[PDB]
Amino acid sequence: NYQPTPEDRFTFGLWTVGWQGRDPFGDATRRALDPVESVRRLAELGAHGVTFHDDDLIPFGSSDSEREEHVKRFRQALDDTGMKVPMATTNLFTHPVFKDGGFTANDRDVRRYALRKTIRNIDLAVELGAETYVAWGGREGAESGGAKDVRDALDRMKEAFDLLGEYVTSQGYDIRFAIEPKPNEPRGDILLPTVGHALAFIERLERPELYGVNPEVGHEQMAGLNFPHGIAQALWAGKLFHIDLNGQNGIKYDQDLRFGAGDLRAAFWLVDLLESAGYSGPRHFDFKPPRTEDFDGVWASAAGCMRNYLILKERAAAFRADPEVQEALRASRLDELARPTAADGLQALLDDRSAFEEFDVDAAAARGMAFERLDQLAMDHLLGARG
Amino acid sequence: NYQPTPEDRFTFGLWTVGWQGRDPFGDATRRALDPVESVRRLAELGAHGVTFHDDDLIPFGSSDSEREEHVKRFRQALDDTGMKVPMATTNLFTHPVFKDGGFTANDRDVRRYALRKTIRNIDLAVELGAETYVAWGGREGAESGGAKDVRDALDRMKEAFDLLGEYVTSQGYDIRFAIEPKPNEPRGDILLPTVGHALAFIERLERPELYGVNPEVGHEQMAGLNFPHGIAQALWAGKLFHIDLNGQNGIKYDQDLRFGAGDLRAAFWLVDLLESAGYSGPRHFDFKPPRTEDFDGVWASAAGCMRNYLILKERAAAFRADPEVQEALRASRLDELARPTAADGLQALLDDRSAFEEFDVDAAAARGMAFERLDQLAMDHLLGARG
Amino acid sequence: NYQPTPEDRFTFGLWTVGWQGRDPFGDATRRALDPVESVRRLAELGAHGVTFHDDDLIPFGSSDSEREEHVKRFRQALDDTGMKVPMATTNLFTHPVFKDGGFTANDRDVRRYALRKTIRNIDLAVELGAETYVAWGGREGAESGGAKDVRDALDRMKEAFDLLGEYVTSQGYDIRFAIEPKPNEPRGDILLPTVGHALAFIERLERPELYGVNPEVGHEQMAGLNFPHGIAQALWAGKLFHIDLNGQNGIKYDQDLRFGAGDLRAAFWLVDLLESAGYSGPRHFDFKPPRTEDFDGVWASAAGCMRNYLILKERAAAFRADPEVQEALRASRLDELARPTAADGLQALLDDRSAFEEFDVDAAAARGMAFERLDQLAMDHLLGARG
Amino acid sequence: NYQPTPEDRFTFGLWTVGWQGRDPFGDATRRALDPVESVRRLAELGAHGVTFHDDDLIPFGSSDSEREEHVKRFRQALDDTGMKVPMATTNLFTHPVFKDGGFTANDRDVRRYALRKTIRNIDLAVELGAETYVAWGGREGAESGGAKDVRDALDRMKEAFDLLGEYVTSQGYDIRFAIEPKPNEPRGDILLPTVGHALAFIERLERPELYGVNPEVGHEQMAGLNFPHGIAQALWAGKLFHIDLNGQNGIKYDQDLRFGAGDLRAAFWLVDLLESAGYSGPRHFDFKPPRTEDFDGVWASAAGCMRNYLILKERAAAFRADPEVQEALRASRLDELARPTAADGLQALLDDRSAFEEFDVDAAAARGMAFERLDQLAMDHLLGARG
Ligand SMILES: O=C(CO)[C@@H](O)[C@H](O)CO
Ligand SMILES: O=C(CO)[C@@H](O)[C@H](O)CO
Ligand SMILES: O=C(CO)[C@@H](O)[C@H](O)CO
Ligand SMILES: O=C(CO)[C@@H](O)[C@H](O)CO
Ligand SMILES: [Mg+2]
Ligand SMILES: [Mg+2]
Ligand SMILES: [Mg+2]
Ligand SMILES: [Mg+2]
Ligand SMILES: [Mg+2]
Ligand SMILES: [Mg+2]
Ligand SMILES: [Mg+2]
Ligand SMILES: [Mg+2]
Ligand SMILES: [O-]
Ligand SMILES: [O-]
Ligand SMILES: [O-]
Ligand SMILES: [O-]
DSSP, rough: OOOGGGGGGGEEEEEEEEEEEETTBBBSSSSOHHHHHHHHHHHHTOOOOEEEEHHHHTTTOOOHHHHHHHHHHHHHHHHHHOOOOOOEOOSSSSGGGGGGGGSSOHHHHHHHHHHHHHHHHHHHHHHTSSSSEEOOOTEEEEESSTTOOOHHHHHHHHHHHHHHHHHHHHTTTEEEEEOOOOOOOSSSSSSSHHHHHHHHHHSSSSSGGGGOOBBBHHHHHHTOHHHHHHHHHHHHHTOOOOOEEOOSSSSOOOBBOOOOOOOHHHHHHHHHHHTTTTTSOOOOOOOOEEETTEEEEHHHHHHHHHHHHHHHHHHHHHHHHHHHHHHHHHHHTHOOOHHHSSHHHHHHHHTTTTTTOOHHHHHTOOOOHHHHHHHHHHHHHHOOOOO | OOOGGGGGGGEEEEHHHHHOBBBOOOOSSSSOOOHHHHHHHHHHHTTOOEEHHHHHHHHHHOOOOHHHHHHHHHHHHHHOOOBBBEEEOOOOOSGGGGGEEEEESSSHHHHHHHHHHHHHHHHHHHTTSSEEEEEOEEEEEESSTTTOOOOHHHHHHHHHHHHHHHHHHHTTOOOEEEEEEOSSSSEEEESOHHHHHHHHHHHTTSGGGGGGEOOBBBHHTTTTTOOOHHHHHHHHTTOBBBOEEOOOOOOSSSSOBBBTOOOOHHHHHHHHHHHHOOOOOOEEEEOOOOTTHHHHHHEEEEHHHHHHHHHHHHHHHHHHOOHHHHHHHHHHHHHHSSSSOOHHHHHHHHHTTTTTTTTOHHHHHHHOHHHHHHHHHHHHHHHHHHO | OOOOOGGEHHHHHHHHHHOOBBBBEEESSSSOOOHHHHHHHHHHHHEEEEEEEEEEEEEEOHHHHHHHHHHHHHHHHHHHHOOOOOEEOOOOOGGGGGGGSSSSSSSSHHHHHHHHHHHHHHHHHHHHHHHEEEEEOOTTSSSSTTTOHHHHHHHHHHHHHHHHHHHHHHHHOEEEEEOOOOOOOSSSEEESSSSHHHHHHHHTTGGGEEEEOOHHHHHHHTTTHHHHHHHHHHHHHOOBBBOOOOOOOSSSSSSBOOOTOOOOHHHOOOOOOHHHHHHOOOOOOOOOTTOOOOOOHHHHHEEEEEEEHHHHHHHHHHHHHHHHHHHHHHTTTHHHHHOOOOTTHHHHHHTTTTTTTSHHHHHHHHHOOHHHHHHHHHHHHHHHOOO | OOOOGGOEEEEEEEHTTTTTBBBTBOOOSSOOOOHHHHHHHHHHTTTOEEEHHHHEEEEEEEOOHHHHHHHHHHHHHHHOOOOOOOEEOOOSSSSGTTOOOOSSSSSSSHHHHHHHHHHHHHHHHHTTTOOOOEEEOTTTTESSSSTTTHHHHHHHHHHHHHHHHHHHHTTTTOHHHHEESSOSSSEEEESSHHHHHHHHTTTTTGGGEEEEOOOOOHHHTTTTTTTHHHHHHHTTTTTTOEEEEEEESSSSOOEEEEEESSHHHHHHHHHHHHHHHOSSSSSSEEOOTTTTTHHHHHHHHHHHHHHHHHHHHHHHHHHOOOOHHHHHHTTTHHHHHHSSSSSHHHHHHOTTTTTTSOOHHHHHHHHHHHHHHHHHHHHHHHHOOOO
8 A cells, every 4th residue: 555665765864854843933842863763763664775964973073983883883773774875965054163154155264174074974975885975055155245256156166066076086986966956044045046056057067977966846946946847957957866855835934844745736747757757866855744743753754755655656657658648648749849840950941931931820829739638637647536 | 417328238128118008907008109219219318229029120920011111210210319239039929829839839830930930030130230139938838747848848949049059150140149037927837947947058059159148137036036146157157148127026927117126135236246247238128117107107217227227336336445345345254255265286185184183163163254244334335324 | 427516606707718818928819708608618517607897798888788788698698507696896907097996096086986887887796696796906006115105095995895885785785795805916016915904904894794805716825825724714703705716836926727726735625624614605716727728628627627626525525534534633632722721711720720830841742743644644535545 | 323312212122132043954153142231232232122032031941039030130230221121922932832832732731831821921021011012923823734723723812812811901901912923934834924814813802902913024025015015004903013123035934134134125115104104112123133143243233223224214204305206296196095085975976977977087097197206216215316
């Protein structure tokens, strides 16, 4: 009944289930979860692996002595359970020294510090076997306009990612980076607000081949955009190295609801797309069990995630296979969208009088697109009202 | 008293002042303005030139006979007044044959037609002397998810812009293109929603050098982003070929208010940036005098535009020159932002123990950024409360 | 298979299916539909009745002669089909004389005119048998701040509704009014933006008993609010005389998609509420078939509406009846929410030391709310994944 | 040079300047400020008084012994400086026992507890001399739909405010309550989201006369509404007992920027309104110095607040007095808006043939409103470009 298996590629962040529940207007409602503990409960539910921030596994300020002790206990846990670690990131947002940013902070000294803190937790990412490395520059921005020269910051940002590449290139690591956009929160405005702004940025770096994106549901939905639309340009441009799943009800604070929640009609068009294009990386889940819940609630919430994906995957599978849905698509000319417009060459088109001088625009404009039917059909499938 | 002169580069679209006032819920409140008429009133107010859609100058369905008559009358007008035409575009949104799009429409035949309609009004753009050519794909999108394969559409979009380049390359024209993003309205979702999404798209075309952007105030402010932030990546990436100025009060229908209106604190940080980076192209104005106004109102509204830019330009000039503002900037370390972080090389940084092993993070984090003062200063300048 | 019958109370506006497709950036894509024609197709699909604007049935400027001819043809149509007319409204937004508003316009003369135009189409509303009368003040607002004294406008608004009541009171009509809020579009800001702002306004009129609300899905969802939350205060306060159903994808232009579309998880919590509280009025549908469609598309789109309501009604019915959903509710204490907090009186509470001096706050705060389970359950029901 | 004096009525919350800087994604960047310390620095800058949450002055869990010690030290501070305390509130959001709400929480026991916690800090509000008492129900809402019966919650909410009134009525206190709306954050959706939703709620309580509102800038601007528009209905309905000033850049997390910041054109239309209607209560400031700042920054940020109000007050004063602005207003008929529409009675209007049968609608619709000029004038005044 929609049971998950490691072969599904469902992964979680230690900081997701582990969220203690502290929000601007409230203290923590839950007690700390030990990383080994999250790992057994997850493996048990049907996951594949887990992701982490340096600061999640190794507490800030930890000596290299205690630092070994947390990596061994984790190491052992991964083995007794079989879980994997296909992605890792740095924590350049919590500590106060990052109040103005990491790679883009004004204090030059603060920038160097954040470049090392990363390089350090990259040697560990590999040591464990992570394939992708993500970077979320949440403290990279400004509330006021004279606080940041956006042109100077974009320089300090390319210089940061470049160095990192030169490092992985020398260290002959097979790892690749994933830049995660957010339009805002915790800064008034964040650098590289959406997938689009990050994709362009990557075509300016020295080694573009080593960079991609890790678009998150709610984040793109914080600017009011169509998430699936955005996962399309990344794939079209071959840059979807990773993805963060969750829920978001519109434009407002980053909610991070469990997957399926929020915009349900949208999560249906994402799975479909991810299945069609053959996305094989991990189906990550960057969510936060609400603070009105306890631990039995955190595990139910993380169960709902995978389960919602599985059903949606099914309901989408049928959608495409339905012999009737297939003819509606032809009725709406999605087959003609796939066909090149001018494979006949420019010259051919400039002389072809069927495209202008003789085109019957009136007869053509009267041709209905039949989009409302193909949708209600889609709707019956998601609800399971077809039969 | 803030009088404009053609040397300011203020330009307008024939369809701006000429707007008749028809909105979804209302008939037109103003009568049609003849293009020659807009041209004399504008030259009179202190402008430099005007932009246009093929359909603005040459009514849809016009024979090549009447078509010559509108280009001559315009031609003569430009001369008796001295106005110039530094930008031109096609109209792929009004006619019903474009209900599903132009370059990305599903009906292949509709795509070819829209490629020619453009190529035609490109030969005219040059004939007049336009330097830039803009493209706004407003009908390029979908309301439902199965209505468009976003990967197939991005193919038909690259194929469209490519052909156009092959054409201008053969026709040895010195013109360049400008893709204008919009996140939505009139379609539920529009392809290449923001500046970011268009910048990445341009690095995939065959001839990237011939493409740029024409970001519009309200449009980026329809997704809730920081406009100036966005004009920074375009400049940083050298792609600001043109720009559309106007006003927008938040997230909602595209208002197109006169310049200065809407977010005033933002229009102050844009002019400053445009002046600093030395933006020399035109200061275009894509606005719509509200329908509660008559013609004396349309001319006052177009007067307010340039005037607001001029004052803002002044108030920003003083801001930067103020000896006190200059030391606040140093106080907030914008001078250190400009300084490279690791010109000493990767190796130097990996050994430099001043950046990690010995960095005093606590002492550094206690260092205030002093951003609130530099802003109130900025605020006094905009209001003119410094003295 | 989710077939509707007049006993469902599904109604439509003549201006919904009849929409010709003209948007700010496009001419009409469909031809005019004659009112009698909409009436036969609708009765055929399974409806109960239709609503209208004076201007929909009787074209603006029509003489009392032709005016009788449109009311007779309509009259006859209603009979050959059995359809009813349970609601009617005035059209104070299209004509240019309403560019500054109707009841709140500055030109005093324009206000009187709009008061009569209404009183006229009220005598007709009854003549036909409408039970409710709706008022949408879309042109009541301003783009600029000095354009309207909001205190003076609220006076001219109470004076407008008052007079109307004095009229229906004298004409001994059994009709009641329904004020429909919108936060914006076509004006920069609209008076009485949300349900809340209209509910308060009604408690100031002379005859409050004769007024209520007609909240529309997308409209409240244009400000980013929770629609069902809003339909709750209206019912709690006994003011839901009518309702407009449709779809809206977030914050942006008013889409008016068919019902079910947009936020699907929200339309599930609305039907449930409407069924629980026993809402018996009409399940109106104020939507707009998209302009990429033709007539076969307009009828399919209006079919999807009712169908989506029917399924959602079912999936919600099961939800509540599920013996398991019932114990989850008890698990989450919705039964304790219904229980009064201090029926024991103030004094009893001030002495009751179980509520403060001895309350164990720590033990109580540790009590999980179990909300994530009751939701995934809800989710399985909507998708039909329970079994 | 825009210096404030207690006669201006500028007040602050202890929790504003005192904010330590902890946000969802970051630890505190500033150290704790002692209440007596905030009081001396504020009195020094030019304030009138300060507001507080029980939990700000008396730490949660404090014994009645230490509880006296904090009220005496505060008491003395107020005297050595002369500051006043015209408003006080309870803290029903931080502690975890309020994770599901206070007055509306499901656990009945949690509701009683929160009713007492309030009644307690009301006896103290008076003891000090506060005139108004505010209530912000931030934890009153839900993320999921089955988590809360919105009809049951509105019952538990009226029962809460009622009891409080019965208490102040018996305790013969001269105090009055102020309900502060927020559409969201920290809950997915909050009960009584906007000023409108709270105004209606007040007309259902047992003792309406004892209730009002305390609208906050950013909060109403979180739903995308026009703040000044909203302060107009409250005044029109005589319910503006208090107000919270600050800044907010659009729709997103609650920023709480210093006053003047965010939407500057809007803060100009608010002061004008507050000055015209003769608002005499306090000009409260509920803001948060950003966490990139230290203490010298917190005092500069709180200086900018009052200063921005003072200038805006001036620039607005001139606006109204300008002989030219006065004739523009007449030109735009704001004088006719103030004039009653039908003081002649219903009958008079029904017979008056100048309002319909003979009204020249075409001649009337051609009458421009001249709104764009009156605005550019307004703009010149705010910038100080008139002369
Ligand atoms: O996206 C967020 C928060 O909005 C983070 O969890 C990143 O994924 C990791 O830095
Ligand atoms: O931006 C718009 C409308 O939102 C257009 O005026 C383009 O500039 C021209 O197609
Ligand atoms: O709501 C709208 C448009 O947003 C109207 O159809 C009203 O229902 C009738 O005036
Ligand atoms: O408005 C907020 C936070 O958004 C509070 O500071 C209230 O004023 C007090 O509970
Ligand atoms: Mg997030
Ligand atoms: Mg994430
Ligand atoms: Mg625009
Ligand atoms: Mg434009
Ligand atoms: Mg609508
Ligand atoms: Mg409606
Ligand atoms: Mg706030
Ligand atoms: Mg507040
Ligand atoms: O997140
Ligand atoms: O535009
Ligand atoms: O509507
Ligand atoms: O706040």
